[PDB]
Amino acid sequence: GPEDTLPFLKCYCSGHCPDDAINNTCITNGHCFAIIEEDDQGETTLASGCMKYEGSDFQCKDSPKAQLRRTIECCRTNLCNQYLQPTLPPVVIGPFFDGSIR
């Protein structure tokens, strides 16, 4: 019956891209994703790619068995991966004191 299936999302890929990709970009009807991770030597690996359709319209979950420090992001708009670098959250502290002006 009614089934308009036509891809409409071109996202750029960094580090890892499929063997069938063109000009370092990929095409999906799902969402574009990007992930960053700190390995035992303290280098960050930046990679992005295209996610095929799954069912979730706007929900990027994670599996409940993660034993690593990392950040991840997902986006449903064109070239959202090209201009988006995943980064770890900044540090924070409640206590404060006066050290200098401005």
UniProtKB/Swiss-Prot annotation:
Annotated glycan sites: 23
Tissues in which the UniProt entry reports expression: Highly expressed in skeletal muscle.
Residue numbers on the Extracellular membrane side: 1-102
S-S pairs: 11-32, 13-17, 26-50, 60-74, 75-80
Region of interest: Mediates specificity for BMP ligand: 57-59
Subcellular location: Cell membrane; Cell surface
Impact when changing residue 8 to Y: In a renal clear cell carcinoma sample; somatic mutation
Domain of life the protein comes from: Eukaryota
Post-translational modification, as annotated: Glycosylated.
Function: On ligand binding, forms a receptor complex consisting of two type II and two type I transmembrane serine/threonine kinases. Type II receptors phosphorylate and activate type I receptors which autophosphorylate, then bind and activate SMAD transcriptional regulators. Receptor for BMP2, BMP4, GDF5 and GDF6. Positively regulates chondrocyte differentiation through GDF5 interaction. Mediates induction of adipogenesis by GDF6. May promote the expression of HAMP, potentially via its interaction with BMP2.
Homology family: Belongs to the protein kinase superfamily. TKL Ser/Thr protein kinase family. TGFB receptor subfamily.
Recorded disease: Juvenile polyposis syndrome: Autosomal dominant gastrointestinal hamartomatous polyposis syndrome in which patients are at risk for developing gastrointestinal cancers. The lesions are typified by a smooth histological appearance, predominant stroma, cystic spaces and lack of a smooth muscle core. Multiple juvenile polyps usually occur in a number of Mendelian disorders. Sometimes, these polyps occur without associated features as in JPS; here, polyps tend to occur in the large bowel and are associated with an increased risk of colon and other gastrointestinal cancers.
Subunit structure: Interacts with low affinity with GDF5; positively regulates chondrocyte differentiation. Interacts with BMP4. Interacts with SCUBE3. Interacts with TSC22D1/TSC-22. Interacts with BMP2; the interaction may induce HAMP expression. Interacts with BMP6. Interacts with heterodimers composed of BMP2 and BMP6 in vitro; the interaction may induce HAMP expression. Interacts with TGFBR3.
Protein name: Bone morphogenetic protein receptor type-1A
Portion of the full-length sequence here: 51 to 152 of 532
